[PDB]
């Protein structure tokens, strides 16, 4: 009696912008599903983000690094917005070492097979002295939402004072979601429509996987109502 929706087009216009078409949907289900999926996407899409940083020769973020154009606070802020895709692990430790004149970008982190840098042109900082050598350890975890550094605390609440440069984690890989319900020229019915979800993300998530995860979350939540006791 109802025509179930199905993925009919996943257009990847760019690495961070994708159009996904669902067809067909009956009248009213288009807006319902669009709003439900948009909210689940914006709310509960997991991802990976920079959590802890430990630069050598640095005690706290309220200090200056030698021969570096930007403050350590600015460096941590730039590392907050680093788009990293991690496969197979929920806790990875990257190492970035650099020296000499030049912009230290995202392409200079020591390469590992389980980690991918979506945007190698992301400028982390700059070096302005030939002898200036920078070396940092970046801990990346897989999480969901936004966990500010002030709330999360160490397991035993006692960690290296010199390190523990805690960066606020914005785990959400998606930044903008629109959805449109448009008339489809179906030769069988005339009340059918199509749901175009236009997604703009950080490039770290596969749009089809994200939509399937959102649908799984929605179904698991509705299972409590369906299985009622």
């Amino acid at each position: 009696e109802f025509l179930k929706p199905r993925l009919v087009d996943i257009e990847q216009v760019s690495s961070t912008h994708a159009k996904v078409t669902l067809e067909p949907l009956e009248r009213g289900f288009g807006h319902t599903l669009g709003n439900a999926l948009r909210r689940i996407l914006l709310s509960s899409m997991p991802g990976c983000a920079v959590t802890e940083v430990e630069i050598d020769g640095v005690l706290h973020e309220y200090s200056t690094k030698e021969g570096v154009q930007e403050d350590i606070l600015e460096i941590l802020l730039n590392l907050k917005g680093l788009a990293v895709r991690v496969q197979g692990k929920d806790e990875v430790i990257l190492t970035l070492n650099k020296s000499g004149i030049g912009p230290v970008t995202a392409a200079d982190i020591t390469h590992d097979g389980d980690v991918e840098i979506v945007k190698p042109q992301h400028v982390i900082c700059h070096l302005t002295d030939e002898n200036a050598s920078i070396s940092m350890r970046i801990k990346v975890q897989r999480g969901r939402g936004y966990v500010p550094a002030s709330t999360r605390i160490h397991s035993e609440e006692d960690e290296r004072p010199i390190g523990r440069l805690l960066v606020d984690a914005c785990y959400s890989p998606v930044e903008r979601i629109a959805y449109n319900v448009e008339a489809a020229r179906v030769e069988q019915r005339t009340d059918l429509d199509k749901l175009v979800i236009e997604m703009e993300t950080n490039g770290t998530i596969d749009p089809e996987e994200a939509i399937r995860r959102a649908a799984t979350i929605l179904a698991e939540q509705l299972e409590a109502f369906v299985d009622l006791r």
Partner: protein
């Protein structure tokens, strides 16, 4: 009677929370009622919230 003076500087982050006074440049001061989740926020036709 003063032998040694040790001055210690403490730096603390202060993040916006319900209650902080925020204003424009026109006297339109107000108080943060709550932090509304991004999906609950109104969005325009392009999906860009406010």
């Amino acid at each position: 009677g003063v032998l040694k003076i040790v001055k210690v500087y403490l730096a603390v982050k202060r993040r916006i929370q319900p209650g902080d006074k925020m204003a424009g440049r026109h006297g339109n001061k107000g108080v943060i009622s709550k932090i509304n989740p991004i999906e609950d926020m109104p969005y325009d036709e392009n999906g860009t919230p406010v």
